[PDB]
Amino acid sequence: LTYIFMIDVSLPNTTPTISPHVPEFTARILEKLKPLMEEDERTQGIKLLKTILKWLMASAGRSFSTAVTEQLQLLPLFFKIAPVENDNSYDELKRDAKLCLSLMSQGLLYPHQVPLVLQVLKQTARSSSWHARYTVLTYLQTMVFYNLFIFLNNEDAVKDIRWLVISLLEDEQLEVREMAATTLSGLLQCNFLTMDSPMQIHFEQLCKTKLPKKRKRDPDTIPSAELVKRHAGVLGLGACVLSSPYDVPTWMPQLLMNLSAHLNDPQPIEMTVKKTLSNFRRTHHDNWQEHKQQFTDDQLLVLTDLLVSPCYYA
Amino acid sequence: MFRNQYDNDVTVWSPQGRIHQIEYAMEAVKQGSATVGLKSKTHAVLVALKRAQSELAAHQKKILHVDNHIGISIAGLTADARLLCNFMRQECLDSRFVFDRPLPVSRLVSLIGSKTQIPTQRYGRRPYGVGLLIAGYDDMGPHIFQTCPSANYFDCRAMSIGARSQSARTYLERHMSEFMECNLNELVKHGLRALRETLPAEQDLTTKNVSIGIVGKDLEFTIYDDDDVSPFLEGLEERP
Amino acid sequence: TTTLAFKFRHGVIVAADSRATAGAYIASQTVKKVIEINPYLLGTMAGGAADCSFWERLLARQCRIYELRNKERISVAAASKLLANMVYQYKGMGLSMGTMICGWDKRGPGLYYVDSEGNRISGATFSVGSGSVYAYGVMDRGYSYDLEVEQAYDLARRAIYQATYRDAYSGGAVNLYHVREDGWIRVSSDNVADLHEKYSG
Amino acid sequence: LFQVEYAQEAVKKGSTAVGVRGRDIVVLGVEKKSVAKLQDERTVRKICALDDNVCMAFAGLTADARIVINRARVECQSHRLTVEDPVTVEYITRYIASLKQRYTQSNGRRPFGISALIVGFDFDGTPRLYQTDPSGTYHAWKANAIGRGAKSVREFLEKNYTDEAIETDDLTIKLVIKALLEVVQSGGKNIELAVMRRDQSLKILNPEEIEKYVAEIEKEKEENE
Amino acid sequence: MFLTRSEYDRGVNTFSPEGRLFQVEYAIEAIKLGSTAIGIQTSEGVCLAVEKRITSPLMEPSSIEKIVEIDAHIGCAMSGLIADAKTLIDKARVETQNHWFTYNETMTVESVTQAVSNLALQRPFGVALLFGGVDEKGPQLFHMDPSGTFVQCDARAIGSASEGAQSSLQEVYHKSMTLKEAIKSSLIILKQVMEEKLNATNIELATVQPGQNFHMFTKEELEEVIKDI
Amino acid sequence: MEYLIGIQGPDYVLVASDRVAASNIVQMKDDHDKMFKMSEKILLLCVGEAGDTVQFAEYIQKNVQLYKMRNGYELSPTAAANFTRRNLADCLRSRTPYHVNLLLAGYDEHEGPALYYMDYLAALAKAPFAAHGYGAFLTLSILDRYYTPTISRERAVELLRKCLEELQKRFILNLPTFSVRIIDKNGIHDLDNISF
């Protein structure tokens, strides 16, 4: 299939070839694949999915023009199916899917492509599947670190991706929240996305939420609106402080004091902040004489007097 | 950037005449939850702040019975702790078996010192990264013994270990004169207030997170968990 | 000691006296000389009471371990062999054990005899103990594969009763067990006086 | 875990083998790779009988397979001794898997480098099929494949395995042949078959014996058209 | 997620200056990759559930067991590959039978998990266990971390997304919860984390009660259950 | 005591064993089998102290089956005999000596039938005919009388029956039944048990 569609190309001053054209084929594929994205039809859809997935991973490194606009429409379906971890029990359709996502994400995009791919990423992110949201975050992570300069040249892209990362930072599910925080830490670390007063006040507001402190003794099976907001706020602060592992900026001490405030907050906020602080402590220890000078004495003693150890300690 | 050649292993002396690994392991006990030990003339207590991974989680067992007349409160690594507890329990049992006698606390801490010191000098065996408060009553009287991964041990009127032990140390050294003539309930109250000194303002001592271990001349070492600690807790005045 | 066991169509029977004697003196008249290895097996006590008890309890241990690991109840033959190996490890050291391992297995009803001497044998009928001879007589006279269940119970009671009547070191109460394909039971335990009162007329 | 990946790649390279489970029969097939002009084919087996009631097929490194096979044989006999009963296929599988996760004497390639199909009949008489992995995970299957191209075979086995296919024992054999035939293009002597045939010891098929079965399915392939 | 690394990590038996053992902490981090499982402790009894993750239809479903029986009164669940656990499982079984042989009494779940942690010391060992059984005290659930530390939990989840399930467990759980209500609850959690339609093949459920021994729900029983929700 | 007997022919070996196993005064089992099948064409007989017979026979049986599984061809009877002799001799001066008396009879495709004799001391000798037990003292003279190197198997059966008749007539211990088997190039083949 790759060798079939290779002759069709987007090279400059190329006439439309008479050879087979990839968009019509992807259109046929998507049209047959709509039900997956009857019971018997579902299985045929899965088999077709397997074949086209193999085609995608084959055409990842070969095609002259990667990421044809039609084939991006398959990414929602590839996203929801793909697993959130690496394991052999998954029956290997999901393993192939994960490989395909990683490979396609490690691919150049034209400037005209990135608004389209970001629109797709926004569409799948509002999808229900928490697996899907985790996958879009990590795909976004690597797909941004590659062609970061394209994304950087496009300001609307930076705006949309910022909005999406912060939006998913507040999602109900803890895994996607922590993943969003990690993506944010990376985006900040590379400086593709830069924190400022808006991010800081947004996270401070979300953290500054009073917990209900009540429950129904006599009788949702879902978490709640308060604690998720608290968690997202502290997650924002954690992504910020982890943005700079080997150096401390001027705002980091204040952020650290604000984290130390929530150390006794109820779970999951406690586990999150403890992990972030432990990571800060291990990373910044190398040049702590240089780092401490930025800090005040009260900040320093407060940070020294922190119980961030894991459960197995004690 | 500032990688240090000489902290790789415990057997390595630095040019500054220090064992960085031992110092670091002594740094580890502070990772644990705070615990307070103090004594009157005829009583000795161990007051600990147990903590949980989750609300559903029940709580970790900081206080332990080595014997009828000896108890401990662990800080640092619980594995190293359980090893030490088994060793000490066996030693006390051996002493009762052989001599029909309770083991002296000074003797027990000395044995712990030897056992802990051994890894420090051997390659490939990391130090016991645990700090203990050893409390018991013997013929001499009540005792409070601190031990560290360094294998040094001390005798104290009172001591606190773990995270934020320093504030409790300050209160304790302020009121150490009072503790000696104190009755049992007052001594427990002092320990509770000292443990409160370490707590953040948001946190407050509760039945669940507090564990009291107490020994006396006519009283075996006991542990009070949640309800058993409530009478001692209720009397304590509100924090400033 | 008098214990016996026989296989018949419906299942396996195990009968034993309750007397336990050190020398002439009877220490205990109420001893349960049949050991509940597990709900699907039985053991029988003879010779050294303590030896048989300990080694049979350890057999139960190994059988439960096997049950959990393999998720299958162990074969009676396997248990008899395992016990034989354990005792043979100690052969010549003064152990006195004789026992009858009774269970139902995939093969069928199983009866195996095991001795400290090292003998391991399967049999339709067996007896072991001081009065075993006297038991063998009556049971061999009365036995068939086609016995009715109550007839088997009565036959066992006759055997144990007469063996007690002859033998000094046997006595007390007959304790009677039936191993069924589902599992074992205690059918009844009767004191020798009631038996004599029954048979006398 | 890192050695496991190398071991899994090694068994991936190895010769294909399959096993099937049937009511009164179990069949084991392994493709006989060409050796050379001058080598003698006797020494290479790719099939081993751990006991009368157990048979094994391995894929991967031959020497490690030899070691495993010997250790399992001696274990089978010792278990027969201690228990007086034939060894269970699950048991010997548990041992071979358990042998993988002791190690080499040096601990080098702690996974020995074979995933093997263990097939046999229980003492009660129920057929069993299992496999092992270098990792040590072991499973049971109605049918399975190992070695090169096993995944493609599993798809063929997934659809082909049926009550109708297993209803006839000779058909139970023929299904294995078709599985190998997809795996190996020789369409002939490059194959080795072994059958347990409940209550009797393993009988390796003769080259003529396999040949007629191959012809029968080849005819049945003809008949469909 | 760029490379974050420090000099002090990668050392097996080296304390970092903070005092942390980072190599083993990372090793614990990997052990949590296993399949998700949930255990609910109630007055009525203990409910354990886990996702099967079978590859193929040909595989015998019973062949892979993510729940096991240490003793008649005990059940245990593990996350990750069974092979790492098998040693601990064997130790638990043999220990409880030592207890029975020696003391003619049933070993408490606290004692059993304690003895397994006593094995675990005497490597990180790469398994998380969730012991659940009934005892004289009552139904109990003990979580043994791959660290080797063991604690009683009213409810607990282990595996790929134990934390996400745990937060759900916090909201739903209460002391008055019945085992039946817990079962329906626990299935709801597995449905969410799995994001797949629950069926008899993709999960295994087991329970322990005071009245009965460890009973693993047969396929028919699981069908009746999931149909209810 | 238990009675064993072996008769070697040109193309066959004939063996019998009494099938009674007993306690001191009483015979518990009237159908005990003292014949152990090491291989397809080889039979091991054992009599002696309780337990030792069984353990030793089983060990030898398993090692032989192991040789078969490992190498793909059964052992020669001579070889199995020498292997048994080695093990028993090693055990003699060990802490645990097995007290057993053996007959190893088997047929080889190359070397044909053979009959071996081994005492508890583990000395080995190949003989045309042999026996163990107290009854051997009685029946060896019968064998010496009516033996020929060229006996037809039916004639061997008749001879064996005469020997057992001598046992029933004279030998104090009741030996009601003797199980009989014949070794051939075809293999081991059972026969109707001679009984009285």
Looking at residue B124, what DSSP letter applies? T
Give the number of beta-carbon pairs within 8 Å between D and F: 18
Helix (H) / strand (E) element for F178: namely strand F177-183
Is the distance from CB of A235 to CB of A181 less than 8 angstroms? yes
What is the torsion angle, in degrees rounded to the nearest 10, for the CA atoms of residue E197, residue E198, residue E199 and residue E205?
170
Dist CA A177 CA A263 (whole Å)? 18
Instruction: Find all residues with CB under 8 Å of B214, minimum gap 6, and list them.
Output: B43, B44, B45, B46, B184, B188, B221, B222, B224
All partners of chain A with 3 or more CB pairs under 8 angstroms: B, E
Return the CATH fold of C1-201: Glutamine Phosphoribosylpyrophosphate, subunit 1, domain 1 (3.60.20)
3-state secondary structure at position E99: helix
Q: How far is E99 from chain A (nearest CA, A)?
A: 28
* The 3-state secondary structure of chain A, one letter per residue: CHHHHCCCCCCCCCCCCCCCCHHHHHHHHHHHHCCCCCHHHHHHHHHHHHHHHHHHHHCCCCCCCCCCCCHHHHHHHHHHHCCCCCCCCCCCHHHHHHHHHHHHHCCCCCCCHHHHHHHHHHHHHCCCCHHHHHHHHHHHHHHHHCCHHHHHHCHHHHHHHHHHHHHHHCCCCHHHHHHHHHHHHHHHHHCCCCCCHHHHHHHHHHHCCCCCCCCCCCCCCCCCHHHHHHHHHHHHHHHHHCCCCCCCCCCHHHHHHHHHHHHHCCCCHHHHHHHHHHHHHHHHHHHHHHHHHHCCHHHHHHHHCCCCCCCCEC
Provide the Cα torsion A263, E173, E52, A101; round to 10°.
-40
CA A201 to chain centre: 22
Nearest to D208 by CA among D225, D222, D188, D194: D188
Give the H/E segment covering residue A144.
helix A130-145
Burial degree of B157 (CB within 10 A; 0-12, 13-18, 19+): middle
Q: Which residue has the tokens 């996702």?
A: E51
* CB contact at 8 A, B41 and B29: no
Structural gaps in chain A: residues followed by a C–N separation over 2.5 Å: 37, 219
Choose, from C1, C3, C99, C164, the residue flagged as catalytic. Answer: C1
Token look-up 């559930």 returns: E49
With an 8 Å Cβ cutoff, are C88 and F51 in contact? yes
Q: Are C106 and D124 in contact (CB under 8 A)?
A: yes
DSSP β-bridge partners for residue C35: C43
How far is it, in rounded angstroms, from Cα D90 to Cα D120? Answer: 9
Using CA atoms, how far apart are residues A74 and A27, in angstroms rounded to an integer? 10
Half-sphere exposure of F103 (CA within 13 A, CB side): 28
What is the least distance, in Å, from the CA of C109 to any CA of chain D?
15
Domain D1-224 belongs to what topology?
Glutamine Phosphoribosylpyrophosphate, subunit 1, domain 1 (3.60.20)
Residue B67, phi then psi, degrees to nearest 5: -165, 180
* DSSP 8-state secondary structure symbol assigned to residue D145: E
For residues B113 and B107, is the Cβ–Cβ distance under 8 A? no
Eight-class DSSP state of B69: S
Per the annotation, binding residues of C are 49
Nearest to F15 by CA among F190, F195, F196: F190
Which amino acid type is present at position D211? Answer: E
Distance from CA of E60 to the nearest CA of D (A): 5
- Stated length of chain B: 240
- Asked if D82 is an interface residue toward chain C (Cβ–Cβ < 8 A), one would say yes
Q: Quote the distance between the C-alpha of residue C197 and its chain's center.
A: 25
Chain C residues whose CB is inside 8 A of the D88 CB are 70
Q: Which residues pair with E183 in a beta bridge?
A: none
Cα–Cα distance for residue pair D118/A205, rounded to 1 Å: 62
Distance of CA F169 to the CA centre of its chain: 23
- The domain over range E22-228 is classified in CATH as 3.10.20.30: no
**Which residue of chain D comes nearest to F64, CA vs CA?**
D77
What is the least distance, in Å, from the CA of F75 to any CA of chain D? 16
User: Would you say B137 and B84 are in contact if contact means Cβ atoms under 8 Å apart?
Assistant: no
Quote the CA–CA distance of C99 and C52 in Å, as a whole number. Answer: 7
Whether the CB of A149 is below 8 Å from some CB of chain E: the reply is: no
Residue F163 CA to residue F138 CA, distance in Å, equals: 8
Query: Exposed/middle/buried for E41, CB within 10 Å: 0-12, 13-18, 19+?
Result: buried
**Beta-carbon count within 10 A of B86 CB:** 14
Compute the Cα dihedral for F64, F67, F72, F75 and give only its sign: negative
Residue D17 bridge partners (DSSP): D30, D146
DSSP state of A313: B
- Dist CA D136 CA D100 (whole Å): 6
Partner residue facing A186 (CB), from E1, E160, E170: E1
Q: Where are the alpha helices (DSSP H) in chain C?
A: 49-70, 76-89, 132-142, 149-166, 192-200
Amino acid letter at F174?
A: N
Which run of H or E residues covers position C191? strand C184-191
User: If contacts are CB pairs under 8 Å, which of residues 19-58 in chain A contact chain E?
Assistant: none
Angle at D20 between CA D14 and CA D22, to 5 degrees: 165
Which among D48, D70, D77 has the least Cβ separation from residue F65?
D77
User: From the candidates C119, C120, C122, C133, which should be mutated to test the interface with F, based on the most F CB atoms within 10 A?
Assistant: C119
Half-sphere exposure of B235 (CA within 13 A, CB side): 11
Binding-site residues of C for bortezomib, in ranges, read: 49
What tokens were used for D25? 């029969």
Are F58 and F52 within 8 A, CB to CB?
Answer: no
On the question of a cis peptide bond just before residue B200, with omega within 30 degrees of 0, the verdict is: no
Give which of E208, E186, E206 is closest to E198, Cα–Cα: E186
Q: By the CB < 8 Å criterion, does E103 face chain C?
A: no
- Contacts F70 to D, Cβ<8 Å: 70, 73
* Cα angle A80-A85-A88, degrees, rounded to a multiple of 5: 100
Q: Can you tell me the distance from the alpha carbon of C30 to that of D167, in angstroms, rounded to the nearest whole number?
A: 59
Residue pair E77/E37 in contact by the 8 Å Cβ criterion: yes
Encoding tokens for residue D81? Answer: 């001794």
**What is D24-39 written as a DSSP string?**
S-EEEEE------SS-
Among the partner-chain residues E60, E83, E86, the one whose CB lies closest to the CB of D141 is E60
Question: In the numeric block, which tokens belong to residue E130?
Answer: 């969730």
Interacting residues of B204 by C-beta distance below 8 A, sequence separation 6+:
B196, B239
Instruction: Give kind and range of the element (H or E) at residue D119.
Output: strand D114-121
Residues of F in Cβ contact (< 8 Å) with C126: 28
Up-side HSE of residue B144: CA atoms within 13 Å toward CB?
24
The two beta strands, F4-8 and E215-216, are unpaired
- Minimum-distance CB partner of F28 among C91, C118, C121: C121
* Cβ–Cβ < 8 Å for B106, B112: no
Q: Residue A293 has which token pair?
A: 């000078």
For testing contact with chain E, the best of C59, C64, C67 (most E CBs within 10 A): C64
Contact assignment for E17 to A130 by CB distance below 8 Å: no
Strands E150-152 and F177-183: unpaired
Measure Cα distances from D12 to A89, D27, D46, D113 in Å: 17, 22, 15, 10
Buried b (16+ CB within 10 A) or exposed e, C65-97: bbbbbeeebbbbbbbbbbbbbbbbeebeeebeb
For residues A254 and A259, what is the distance between their CA atoms, to the nearest angstrom? Answer: 9
* Rounded-to-integer distance, Cα D25 and Cα C199, Å: 58
Burial-class residue B73 by CB neighbours within 10 Å (0-12, 13-18, 19+): buried
Q: Would you tell me the crossing angle of helices A252-261 and A225-241 to the nearest 10 degrees?
A: 150
For residues C107 and B211, give the distance between their C-alpha atoms in angstroms, rounded to a whole number: 59
Whether chains F and D touch (3+ CB pairs under 8 A) is answered by: yes
Closest Cα in chain A, distance from residue B233 (Å): 21
Q: Please tell me if residue E69 touches chain C, with a CB cutoff of 8 Å.
A: yes
**DSSP states of A166-212:** HHHHT-S-HHHHHHHHHHHHHHHHHTSS---HHHHHHHHHHHS----
The Cα–Cα gap between A268 and A274 comes to 10
The closest alpha carbon to C100, from C170, C14, C187, belongs to C14
Helix crossing, E82-103 with E109-120: angle to 10°? 130
Per-residue DSSP letter, F193: P
Tell me the two tokens of residue C88: 């043979």
Rounded CA separation C31/C186 (Å): 15
Inter-chain CB proximity E56 and D130 less than 8 Å? no
Closest listed residue to residue A73, CA positions, set A8, A141, A122, A27: A27
Return the axis-axis angle of helices A197-207 and A225-241, rounded to nearest 10°. Answer: 140
Q: Is C1 labeled as catalytic in the residue annotation?
A: yes
Q: Whole-angstrom Cα distance, residue F139 to residue F162?
A: 9
Q: What is the DSSP letter of A287?
A: G
Residue spans per domain, chain F: 1-196
User: Are E132 and E208 spatial neighbours (Cβ–Cβ below 8 Å)?
Assistant: yes
How many C-beta neighbours within 10 Å does residue E90 have? 16
Answer yes or no: do C121 and F96 touch at CB < 8 A: no
> What distance lies between CA A185 and its chain's CA centroid?
10
3-state helix vs strand vs coil in chain F, percent to 5: 35, 30, 35
